[PDB]
């Protein structure tokens, strides 16, 4: 919330100081359905088809 | 100049300029076939024992004496390799250990990373005996101290004697690696299975001990981060158990 | 409530800098498909 | 030769009959719809249940008849009527009104037809990311018992293709369905009890067979 | 195989529906007309915008239905109606009445059709003195921004073919359009905002995607 | 004329005069290599999945309608094969099932032993739905009834319709074996993996169902034992999972 219309939506924050066991980020890998993958170039194609399958590169 | 390594359904990334210590010149391998031919048939999992397991990171601050882990049982809750520890009466394995740091060019410090076989430890009371909890806590590290400890049943963990009664500057006799924040930040050690019998039970014996010890403490200045994270990743190699049929 | 795999990232050590460098920083993610990708049953998209 | 699988299963049948209007005050009576499965036709269902896994193509033919409503207004002179028949694959947009945008999506195949001509016909392939369809599933959908999502086969929707402010008319569509190039696996015993609903195998207990007079009784010979 | 360019773009769609009368007191309601472009069909527009340059042939089919007006007069006995469908190339004369001379020019191709038969159909080639069509133009017409004259594709006009003093009738035409033998150049990102009008790329600013709970949130596994 | 069979650390004893049904002519085997070459790599345990697992015996008395088990999840608590059900997301396997009786020459009776793929069952209420507990209880058998049942969410388990709505005299269409106390007391069925996809998840789907049904009830006289024990033993074959690395 609060940053769906800024360039900040694309930046994962790495903070300063000592936090050496905390999470940085996490997501489910679901192109086509999940909001974080839905509007990419891969997501936009997959949404034209009712069945798809393969491997993905991050 | 980055390599990407996949074991099973795990993937990590290292630098191709890595340096690797093979412990005594010996790569891990299966006890071949015929030490105990007739009624000693082994089996091997090779399913999800060969895969990267990553522990929690530790936090290196200005006054950190050091950390140690016991092997195995640092992996007794790690998925399948831990299941096999309960289902089987005897086993054996070698390991690959990666240690990594995350630091900048404005930090400084020096670490020793050493793998010590049969690291029998002393009690804080000379006429006492060590407890089972004070030797290990599984996947959580124990800590060295900077002065001499007290209390009952505790390992005497002053860092200059490394809990074994030797001088800590002499641990280079074991398979070891140096991490100097100035020149590298990673270390790989490949350990084979070392025992005086071919197989053994994996619950009441600690084959070896991994230790990480700062020889020059971490230093930084004005508004750098005040800590540095260290990360340990382990892949078991050529694991083998007693047959069940 | 997905039945899909996941990816997570953890601080192993923490970030260490010298004097006179910015304190915070950022990571970026890129996604793509590998050569073995297949699609079936052309339909209508739910976005316009 | 007549007991081969193709000659036993590959036969046409009427599986759905529906009615739809050009003008109405319900707006769901303006189009007709059907979900494709083979569980609400009791005679085809039983022949299909002799096997556990099936694979086929579908062929669908449409018979369409119209009528002017008996409401009031006579003396009309009308051109022949046009109809649109849309197939939606699994994972497609579903219309909710007859004016919706989904009646124009480029990936929903569609047929345009005007009365007086030969009856329209489309051919659908085997559409499943699995390797066969299943008539029986001893599992959970992820939760409904006995329902697996690999059996989705799509839907059919039919409407009129007029312009603005059309004249009142009522149409009826009949769909004739036929499987082709069929293959079956794992035979089963025949259904002994009557079917109770279209999604389960539920049943009331039934007798094994009917009685006779005694265990020796044979009827007198002619 | 289903992601090839031909299977993705070569599909039929209804792009224009219009009404026209035989007698009226407006004289623009006596014929129907359409300018050929692919910017007022929102689903085809978006699939076409993934590329910068396109080249195709066109195929057009016409579905035509008639009706006697509910005005008053019944008991009629009428022969089937005839219609004329005229295509005008780029650089051709445009009619302004249904009695105009341009409905008879030898270089405007034309189709004559009577109801009851199969639906009529014509095939148009790639018509441009340039080498491809363009979906995007960052220029001036010579002055309108974004409009270049190489994209002209012609027009279609439809009327009735009666004689003098005809009887009142109302017809509706639906045009189905299909590109063929397609080639595309220079891929582009997909349109993220809604379209606002048919000639510009104008838009109101839109969010990049929808929100979730936190940057760590993954839903509980079943 | 007795054979002794050892799988792993298990040993059982059978008679060499056994008869074996291979279900549809097909022995079990691995999906060979290249259905899904690139990012679908499997692994196989072959450690203590290939071993005999023995359930509790059931007691055949004068009025016993029958018993049934679901596969898998009759083995979800069985050592390693059960551990692998939790660690892995997809799997597959074939099975060997031995069924044995212990009876004398003064007893009499007849059993059908049948393995039924996709045995979808009906509810006791026609407009109802079946519960998860009423379909199976793991390594404990469910029981058929001799009259029609009631209660909510229960399988309608009258034995003449076998819970599936068919005539029970027609279950010979499936892989089956007869046990006639007069002539034999044992039955072996080898089942391959049968599905409409190559792998699947092993928790929300029951591949097949083992049923044991008396067609002629047990009879004895004056001072014979009043029951007969039945014993079931299962060995998984060619098990295979998704790779984890």
Q: Token pair 């993937």 is at which residue?
A: B11
- What's the CA gap between B195 and B179, in Å, rounded? 28
C25: left (phi over 0), alpha (psi -120 to 50) or beta: beta
- At residue E203's C-alpha, the angle toward residues E200 and E205, to 5°, is 160
Nearest CA in chain C to E8: C42
Cβ–Cβ below 8 Å for A21 and B57: yes
* Distance from the F135 Cα atom to the nearest Cα atom in chain C, whole angstroms: 24
- What's the CA gap between D45 and D51, in Å, rounded? 11
| B155: DSSP letter | B
| F171: DSSP letter | G
Backbone φ and ψ of F6, nearest 5°: -120, 120
- What's the CA gap between F197 and F220, in Å, rounded? 48
Set of chain F residues whose Cβ sits within 8 Å of the Cβ of B44:
47
Q: Give the 3-state secondary structure of residue D27.
A: coil
Q: How far is CA E23 from the centre of its chain?
A: 26
Q: Does D107 touch chain C (CB under 8 A)?
A: yes
Query: What Å distances lie between residue E209 and A34, A58, C45, CA to CA?
Result: 10, 19, 16
Set of chain D residues whose Cβ sits within 8 Å of the Cβ of C3:
142
Q: How far is CA B122 from the centre of its chain?
A: 19
Q: What is the largest CA-CA distance in chain A?
A: 47
Q: Does E121 touch chain D (CB under 8 A)?
A: no
E209: CB partners within 8 A, 6+ apart: A4, A9, A35, A36, A38, A39
Q: Give the 3-state secondary structure of residue D4.
A: coil
Residue-wise DSSP of B48-65? SSSS-EE---EEE-SS--
Q: Give the 3-state secondary structure of residue D181.
A: strand
CB pairs under 8 A between D and F: 96
CA proximity to E82, closest of E168, E23, E163: E163
Cβ–Cβ below 8 Å for D201 and F205: no
Task: Note whether F118 and F208 are within 8 A (CB).
Answer: yes
* Distance from the D106 Cα atom to the nearest Cα atom in chain A, whole angstroms: 10
* DSSP alpha helix (H) spans, chain D: 5-9, 42-48
Cβ–Cβ below 8 Å for D91 and A48: no
Q: What is the 3-state secondary structure (H, E, C) of C1-48?
A: CCCCCEEEEECCCCCCCCCCCCCCEEECCCCEECCCCEEEEECCCCCC
Q: Which two tokens stand for residue E221?
A: 């596994």
Q: Does D89 touch chain C (CB under 8 A)?
A: yes
Query: Please, is F203 exposed, middle or buried when counting C-beta atoms within 10 Å of its C-beta (0-12, 13-18, 19+)?
Result: middle
Secondary element (H or E) of residue F79:
helix F79-87
- What's the CA gap between A19 and D207, in Å, rounded? 73
Q: Domain containing E206: what range?
A: 1-222
Set of chain F residues whose Cβ sits within 8 Å of the Cβ of A55:
38-39
Set of chain F residues whose Cβ sits within 8 Å of the Cβ of C36:
37-39
- Cis ω on the peptide bond leading into residue F72 (within 30° of 0)? yes
- What's the CA gap between D57 and D36, in Å, rounded? 13
Q: Within 10 A of B21 (CB to CB), how many other CB atoms are there?
A: 16
> What total of structural domains would you count in chain E?
1
Q: Token pair 């008395």 is at which residue?
A: F61
Q: From the CB coordinates, do chains A and D have 3 or more pairs under 8 Å?
A: yes
Cβ–Cβ below 8 Å for D142 and C44: no
N-terminal to C-terminal alpha carbon distance within chain E: 34
Q: From the CB coordinates, do chains E and B have 3 or more pairs under 8 Å?
A: no
Chain A partners (3+ C-beta pairs within 8 A) = B, C, D, E, F
Set of chain F residues whose Cβ sits within 8 Å of the Cβ of B50:
245
F205: CB partners within 8 A, 6+ apart: D137, D138, D139, D140
C→D interface, C-beta within 8 Å:
3, 40-46, 48
Q: Within 10 A of B49 (CB to CB), how many other CB atoms are there?
A: 26
Q: Within 10 A of D2 (CB to CB), how many other CB atoms are there?
A: 5
Q: Which two tokens stand for residue A20?
A: 């050496």
* DSSP alpha helix (H) spans, chain B: 79-87
CB pairs under 8 A between C and D: 31
Set of chain C residues whose Cβ sits within 8 Å of the Cβ of D105:
43-45
Q: How far is CA D63 from the centre of its chain?
A: 14
Q: Domain containing B93: what range?
A: 1-245
* Distance from the F11 Cα atom to the nearest Cα atom in chain B, whole angstroms: 7
Query: Please, is F236 exposed, middle or buried when counting C-beta atoms within 10 Å of its C-beta (0-12, 13-18, 19+)?
Result: buried
Cβ–Cβ below 8 Å for C44 and E3: no
Q: Does B103 touch chain C (CB under 8 A)?
A: yes
Beta strands in D25-154 (DSSP E): 32-35, 51-67, 82-88, 110-114, 121-124, 133-134
Residue-wise DSSP of chain A? ---TTSGGGG-EEE--S--TT-EEEEEE--TTTSTTTTTSHHHHHHTTEEEEE--EE-
Angle between helices F79-87 and B79-87 (to 10 degrees): 170
> What total of structural domains would you count in chain B?
1
- What's the CA gap between E8 and C45, in Å, rounded? 13
Q: Which two tokens stand for residue A1?
A: 């919330």
Cβ–Cβ below 8 Å for B59 and A20: yes
Backbone φ and ψ of D42, nearest 5°: -70, -30
- What's the CA gap between E54 and B190, in Å, rounded? 59
CA proximity to F49, closest of F93, F95, F80: F80
Cross-sheet strand order for the sheet of B176-180: B142-143, B67-71, B208-219, B108-117, B176-180
Between the CA atoms of F141, F146, F150 and F154, what dihedral angle is there, to the nearest 10 degrees?
20
- What's the CA gap between B218 and B221, in Å, rounded? 11
Q: What is the number of alpha carbons within 13 Å of residue F30 lying toward its C-beta?
A: 14
Q: Which two tokens stand for residue E5?
A: 């360019």
Q: What is the 3-state secondary structure (H, E, C) of D130-151?
A: CCCEECCCCEECCCCECCCHHH
Q: What is the number of alpha carbons within 13 Å of residue E10 lying toward its C-beta?
A: 16
In this complex, which of C3, C42, C46 lies closest to D93 when CB atoms are compared? C46
Secondary element (H or E) of residue B235:
strand B228-242
Cβ–Cβ below 8 Å for E209 and A41: no
Q: What is the number of alpha carbons within 13 Å of residue E5 lying toward its C-beta?
A: 14
Secondary element (H or E) of residue D173:
strand D170-187
Q: What is the 3-state secondary structure (H, E, C) of chain E?
A: CCCCHHHHHCCCEEEEEEEEECCCCCCCCCCEEEECCCCCCHHHHHHHCCEEEEEEEEEEEEEEEEECCCCCCCCCCCCCCEEEEEEECCCCCCCCCCCCHHHHCCCCCEEEEECCCCCCEEEECCCCCCCCEECCCCCECCCCECCCHHHCCCEEEEEECCCCCCCCCEEEEEEEEEEEEEEEEEECCCCCCCCCCCCCCCCCCCCCCCCCCCCCCCCCCC
- What's the CA gap between E188 and E46, in Å, rounded? 11
Q: Are strands F228-242 and F42-43 parallel, antiparallel or unpaired?
A: antiparallel
| F170: DSSP letter | G
Set of chain C residues whose Cβ sits within 8 Å of the Cβ of E3:
39
Q: Does F33 touch chain C (CB under 8 A)?
A: no
Q: Within 10 A of E205 (CB to CB), how many other CB atoms are there?
A: 7
Q: Give the 3-state secondary structure of residue B39.
A: coil
Backbone φ and ψ of B130, nearest 5°: -85, 150
Nearest CA in chain D to A53: D129
Q: Within 10 A of F104 (CB to CB), how many other CB atoms are there?
A: 11
Secondary element (H or E) of residue F83:
helix F79-87
Cβ–Cβ below 8 Å for F243 and B87: no
Q: Within 10 A of D57 (CB to CB), how many other CB atoms are there?
A: 15
CB pairs under 8 A between A and B: 24
In this complex, which of A37, A46, A55 lies closest to C36 when CB atoms are compared? A55
- What's the CA gap between F108 and D45, in Å, rounded? 42
Q: From the CB coordinates, do chains E and A have 3 or more pairs under 8 Å?
A: yes
* DSSP alpha helix (H) spans, B39-162: 79-87
Task: Note whether B49 and B80 are within 8 A (CB).
Answer: yes
Query: What Å distances lie between residue B51 and B47, F86, F87, F149, F160, CA to CA?
Result: 9, 17, 13, 51, 52
Q: How far is CA B107 from the centre of its chain?
A: 25
Task: Note whether D129 and C39 are within 8 A (CB).
Answer: no
- What's the CA gap between B72 and D121, in Å, rounded? 69
- What's the CA gap between F123 and B186, in Å, rounded? 62
Secondary element (H or E) of residue F80:
helix F79-87
Between the CA atoms of B159, B162, B164 and B167, what dihedral angle is there, to the nearest 10 degrees?
-90
In this complex, which of E68, E116, E172 lies closest to D77 when CB atoms are compared? E68
């Amino acid at each position: 919330e609060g940053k769906l219309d800024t360039m900040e939506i694309y930046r994962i924050p790495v903070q300063s100081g000592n936090h050496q066991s905390s999470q940085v980020f996490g997501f489910q890998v679901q192109p086509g359905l999940d909001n974080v993958f839905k509007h990419t170039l891969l997501g936009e194609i997959l949404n034209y088809y009712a069945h798809w399958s393969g491997s993905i590169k991050l | 100049r980055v390599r990407s390594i996949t074991l099973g359904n795990s993937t990590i990334t290292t630098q191709e300029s890595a340096n690797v210590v093979v412990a005594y010149g010996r790569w891990p391998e299966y006890l071949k076939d015929n030490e105990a031919t007739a009624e000693d048939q082994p089996t091997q999992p090779d399913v999800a024992t060969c895969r990267f397991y990553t522990l929690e990171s530790v936090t290196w601050e200005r006054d950190s004496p050091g950390w140690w882990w016991k092997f195995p049982d640092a992996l007794k809750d790690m998925g399948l390799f831990g299941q096999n520890m309960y289902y089987h009466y005897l086993g054996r394995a070698g390991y690959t250990i990666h240690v990594q740091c995350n630091a900048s060019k404005f930090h400084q410090g020096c670490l020793m990373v050493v793998c010590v076989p049969e690291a029998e430890m002393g009690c804080s009371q000379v006429d006492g005996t060590v407890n089972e909890h004070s030797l290990s806590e599984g996947e959580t590290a124990k800590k060295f101290a900077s002065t001499s400890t007290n209390g009952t049943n505790t390992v005497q963990s002053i860092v200059t004697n490394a809990g074994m009664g030797v001088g800590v500057g002499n641990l280079t006799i074991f398979p070891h690696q140096w991490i100097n924040l100035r020149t590298n930040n990673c270390a790989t050690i490949v350990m084979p299975y070392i025992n005086n019998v071919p197989m053994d039970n994996m619950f009441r014996h600690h084959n070896f001990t991994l230790m990480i010890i700062p020889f020059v403490p971490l230093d930084y200045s004005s508004d750098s981060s005040t800590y540095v994270p260290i990360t340990v990743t382990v892949a078991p190699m050529c694991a083998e158990y007693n047959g069940l049929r | 409530y997905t039945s899909a795999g996941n990816v997570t990232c953890w601080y192993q050590t923490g970030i260490v800098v010298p004097a006179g460098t910015p304190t915070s920083c950022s990571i970026m993610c890129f996604v793509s498909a590998c050569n073995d990708f297949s699609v079936r049953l052309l339909k209508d998209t739910p976005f316009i | 030769s007549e007991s081969s699988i193709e000659n036993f299963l590959c036969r046409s049948a009427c599986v759905y009959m529906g009615e739809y209007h050009t003008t109405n005050t319900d707006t769901s009576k303006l189009f007709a719809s059907w979900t494709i499965n083979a569980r609400r036709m009791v005679q085809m269902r039983r022949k299909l249940e002799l096997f556990t896994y099936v694979r086929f193509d579908m062929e669908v033919t449409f018979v369409i008849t119209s009528k002017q409503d008996q409401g009031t207004q006579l003396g009309q002179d009308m051109p022949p009527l046009t109809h649109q028949i849309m197939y939606i694959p699994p994972g497609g947009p579903i219309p909710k009104s007859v004016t919706d945008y989904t009646w124009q999506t480029s990936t929903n195949p569609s047929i345009f037809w005007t009365e007086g001509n030969a009856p329209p016909r489309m051919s659908i392939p085997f559409i499943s990311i699995g390797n066969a369809y299943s008539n029986f599933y001893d599992g959970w959908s992820h939760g409904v018992y006995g329902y697996n999502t690999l059996n989705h086969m799509g839907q059919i929707y039919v409407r009129h293709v007029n312009g603005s402010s059309p004249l009142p008319m009522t149409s009826t569509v009949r769909m004739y369905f036929k499987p082709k190039h069929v293959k079956v696996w794992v035979p089963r015993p025949p259904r002994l009890c009557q079917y109770k609903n279209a999604s389960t195998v539920n049943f009331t207990p039934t007798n094994i067979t009917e009685k006779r007079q005694s265990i020796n009784y044979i009827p007198e010979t002619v």
